[PDB]
Design a protein around this ligand. Sequence first.
Ligand code: NA
Ligand code: NA
Ligand code: NA
Ligand code: NA
Ligand code: NA
Ligand code: NA
Ligand code: NA
Ligand code: NA
Ligand code: NA
Ligand code: NA
Ligand code: NA
Ligand code: NA
Ligand code: NA
Ligand code: NA
Ligand code: NA
Lengths: 140, 141, 140, 140, 143, 141, 140, 141, 141, 141
Amino acid sequence: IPKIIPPELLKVLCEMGHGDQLVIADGNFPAESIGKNAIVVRMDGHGGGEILKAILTVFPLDTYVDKPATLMEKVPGDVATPIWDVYAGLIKEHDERGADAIGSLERFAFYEQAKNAYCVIASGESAQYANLILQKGVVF
Amino acid sequence: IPKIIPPELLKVLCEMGHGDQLVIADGNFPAESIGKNAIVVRMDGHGGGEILKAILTVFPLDTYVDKPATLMEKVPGDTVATPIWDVYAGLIKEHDERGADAIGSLERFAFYEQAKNAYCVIASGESAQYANLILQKGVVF
Amino acid sequence: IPKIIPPELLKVLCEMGHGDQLVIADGNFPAESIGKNAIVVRMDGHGGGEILKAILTVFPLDTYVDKPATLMEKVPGDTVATPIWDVYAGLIKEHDERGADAIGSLERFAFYEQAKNAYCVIASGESAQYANLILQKGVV
Amino acid sequence: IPKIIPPELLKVLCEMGHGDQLVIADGNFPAESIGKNAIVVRMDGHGGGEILKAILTVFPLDTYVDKPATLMEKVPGDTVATPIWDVYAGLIKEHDERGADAIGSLERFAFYEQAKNAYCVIASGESAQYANLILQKGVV
Amino acid sequence: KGIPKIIPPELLKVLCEMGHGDQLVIADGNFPAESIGKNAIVVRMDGHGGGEILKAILTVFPLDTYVDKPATLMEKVPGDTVATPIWDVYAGLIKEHDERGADAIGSLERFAFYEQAKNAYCVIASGESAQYANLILQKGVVF
Amino acid sequence: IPKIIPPELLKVLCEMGHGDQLVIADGNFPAESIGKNAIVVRMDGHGGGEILKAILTVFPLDTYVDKPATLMEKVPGDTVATPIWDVYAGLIKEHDERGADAIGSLERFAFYEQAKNAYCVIASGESAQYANLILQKGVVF
Amino acid sequence: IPKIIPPELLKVLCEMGHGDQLVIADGNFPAESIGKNAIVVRMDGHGGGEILKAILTVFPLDTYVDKPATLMEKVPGDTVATPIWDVYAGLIKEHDERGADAIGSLERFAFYEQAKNAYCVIASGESAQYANLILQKGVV
Amino acid sequence: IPKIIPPELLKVLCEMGHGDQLVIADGNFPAESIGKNAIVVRMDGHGGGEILKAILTVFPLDTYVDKPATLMEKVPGDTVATPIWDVYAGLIKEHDERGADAIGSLERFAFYEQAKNAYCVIASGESAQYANLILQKGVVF
Amino acid sequence: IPKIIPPELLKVLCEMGHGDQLVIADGNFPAESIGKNAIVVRMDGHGGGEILKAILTVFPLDTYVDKPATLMEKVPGDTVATPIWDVYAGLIKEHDERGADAIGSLERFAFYEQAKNAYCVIASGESAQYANLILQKGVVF
Amino acid sequence: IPKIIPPELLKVLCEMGHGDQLVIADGNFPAESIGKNAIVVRMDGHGGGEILKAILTVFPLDTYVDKPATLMEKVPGDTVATPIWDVYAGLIKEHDERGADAIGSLERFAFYEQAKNAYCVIASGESAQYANLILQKGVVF
Ligand code: NA
Ligand code: NA
Ligand code: NA
Ligand code: NA
Ligand code: NA
Ligand code: NA
Ligand code: NA
Ligand code: NA
Ligand code: NA
Ligand code: NA
Ligand code: NA
Ligand code: NA
Ligand code: NA
Ligand code: NA
Ligand code: NA
């Protein structure tokens, strides 16, 4: 069990089932309001990459959709996003799809999808557009 | 009364009335999120057959509908076998003469929508896929 | 004040006002699920007639509607006898001059729909089928 | 399973273990105050005998103590008849060969003290005075 | 309809579920009803006096005959000479239901009174403007 | 501050702002059900007049609407005297030159729907004919 | 950090993210009813200017919208002077180049509707009318 | 009613009775922990003098004790000026002829023990040290 | 991680620290009343052996005491076989060299008093003789 | 304000006053059970040094006692190295001239007893043993 996962989040990850979603929220993300109907777990001292790595050790990404990981598209007009490659690299560790497992949603569509999440993890990730929705797959 | 039923589930089964539904959720099912507005009872160490057997000893299946038991249909392109469906049919036949004919089905997403209306979701540890089962309560005459 | 009425139900009956409804649920009725947004009072050891008689001693039936008492109609093809309907009519006639004319009916699923709006559901142990009754409160 | 037992009390009876006590409270008993730290189940329309009969069908009396059933003694100088004590002894005899020898007693205020330790207090409508009974659960 | 109109539904519930020996406090306007009643049920009756509350309660609440003095007043602080005519009003209202009348009323020193009131099942917060108009009532038997 | 106002109601009256409504409900009104999403204050031993009188000492009536007080319209057949309406008009006149002109009305079922939106319902013991009253709070300048 | 901000409001301001709104409510605003589904923080002893100045030291205004601050428009016919609007624009100018141009407006009832969506309503004692202000949080 | 008092504190002051205590806590005081079993009202942007002035307009000080206001004594060895003590005396003198004589004191830990029994703790932002004040409520005759 | 452990028990096992205790209660044990101040996890369908086996995969037994597992002493004069004690000893031996030497005991009422202090009580359906077991958590080095 | 501090912990640190204590719990510490009556904030992915450094940026150590920081003494016979104690002393020295002299100690079980009185327990992931630290808050002048 990854050391950074608090007992409440371990419980959450275990009780999620096929198709449930969680959000890794970056430091700018309105995690408490979006997650008002969800379980919000604070991880303010941690970045998106280390959180994703920890989750992927125990959380299978859904194979029943082509893109079980979802990023937020940059607002038209709007910075470099190397964390997206970090995310792809981490997914590649566990899932052969790697970067092809990652889709995207326009900002407001992303918020709408995130309000449906079972759990929002409030990170301290300082990179912008570092939000990531993960959809749980099957344990076979 | 089957030894495996915890006091809370005994209370649930008793307070359910005619037409109420419960869900026997397999180990892959999103029991907590689907059951967010229902009573969720954990039974992680038990399989679907053992739970269904216990429930049927104390829970009459509805005769006011043709198919009081509902399975989740396999997603198109998913060819996994489902011998557990046959296990369930055998268990149902022991209590209800309709047997397999009392078992209907719903497309995956339709099944989720119906399960959200259940009074109670039982989170089993059943490892078989598509081992979810909705049960509708009948009358005590 | 009828001895069978528990303190909580006395409070309920007193705080209901003109137009509020209560359901006397028979033993087969889904009282807890239907009453999810209501006050559910358990009276599992009592029949419908006993409960109705007790209630009517303290609960005026609405004269601002035709039919302040409502039965559940038998489902198509169900041929079970319903002698309790005459018992209920007899009891209502002890308190309201309209007697059986104060009793209407709803199809089974429409009955459930109306019962979800009740202020209080009383879960009886009445063994007779179709022994449910919705009552609407009048003025004091 | 006796029809008069509501679902909450069935849960209570099942989750009680060896040595847990419940109180069958008569109509004059301060059930809510004594039971402030316990589960209080209302049974206002039922007598002590009816309730005891129902409980004993599902509740084994403790054989690890001499007197698993306990009555409240009459206040010195209160000469009121207590026929219900013989009714209780008869009911106990039906389920436990000890019969009346399984029944002890406590002075009024000592009875209140013991009752405050009960897991569950059942508030009956029993009109007879000194019709309270503490029952201690045995092994299954 | 035999029930006094001033009793709110919560208090009717309280009066019914009290049993033999349970106590309630009719708290005067100056009484610390919320703090004393921290572990009790507090019912607000701010617009009502002590006499009208007592009169209403006694229509539904039998006073305990297993003790000599089921009603208890607060004793005046030594040196406080304030008139207390409501004590005789309370006696008259009790006498209407219980032959003991004034003899059914005991008293407790101020701080002892607070200690006993903390044990009450319910504290009724009246608006009674008279001092020392607090009254503890102990419930009797319904035979 | 009038003595009849309990501490909770004082808090409510202070918390209310411009446009907020309260209901003075008569003895027959379904106060608890209508106010299920509001704050319900019990005043069972008190009449509509005495309650209104007390409230108006601390509650300004809205001048941004013509009729900040609302009565329930009589049942279509009913010719009964409504002396409490004149009582209410009189009490309003003490604080607001509009007096009776500040009182509007709503049909029974529309009145219930408006009452469901109130911040607070005061459950009085009023027995007078057609005594329910909605009040809308104004500005403190 | 400003002395006037209580610990609960500090937590609110930290947990808000990009796009979240708070309302600074004037003394006449229906802060509790509007904020029924929000966090309402009482600041009854403080004016609108004092509160805005404090908030802006820790709360970045959104640059992803042109007008992240919103005033309530005067009711047509209500000709009351609104000098606080200039006080607000001045305070905004200290942190944001846009100054007065960062302030939009909503008709009275539209304003109430939008305020119902706020994460937090701060209930000021501001005695001036039309002193309400909605603020939308930007990025860090 | 002084404008600085929030609705909840108005409710608190009204529901306190003869002998109940409240604490005006300075900015250094452990108001939340001391007040764990009480009602804690945040007034972080206000000083002790302004709070006391506001409270005294609606809160009578107990005449059944000699000293209804209580300060915290300086820890032996803590040489610090406490000009706010004279401020407090002045404000009390406005309402109670006893003035400075109505103010007693408790050693630090005795003070905390007494404060734990208060009905309400008001958490001020007062930066003056030893600016804590316990007030005991009197009678409304 | 053994499949029988429900999410809530996983959380419990993770949040326990050095010296914390859990009780594996048998089917006759008063788990809800003893555990009134603890977290009670229902495991009604499982035996003491399988729960212990599962727990020990994730839960180190304390080495700062000699006997981190505690059994309930038999009723005086009871000479009934206690085969589950050997089952327990074997399961402990798989993880801890002390094996049976890691197991102590308490008289029935002393055992209840200690169980009242446990962080978590697991309500099993174990019917074997003298099957209650208290476990004390060790260190992760 | 250090990035690692979550909103809830910021609120805790602000609302603590003079003499209130918090515990930085190491990964082996029974943070949830000891903190049953406190606020427990999870910081599982962070070590003791990192947390102490962040806390000391916003939390003044009490000068009204000689030793406002408290360590847990090693169990007699447990000779495990404790280099973190020097790390802690160095971090304290950055804010308080007392440095290591500001650190006292309590025997293990006495440490648990004292920690039960803390306002807040921070559950770190610190892997070193005896890395628990109790901090007592001072005044802001
Ligand atoms: Na999958
Ligand atoms: Na599934
Ligand atoms: Na049927
Ligand atoms: Na039915
Ligand atoms: Na009528
Ligand atoms: Na009795
Ligand atoms: Na036994
Ligand atoms: Na009596
Ligand atoms: Na106005
Ligand atoms: Na306004
Ligand atoms: Na921005
Ligand atoms: Na006085
Ligand atoms: Na160890
Ligand atoms: Na430790
Ligand atoms: Na200091």
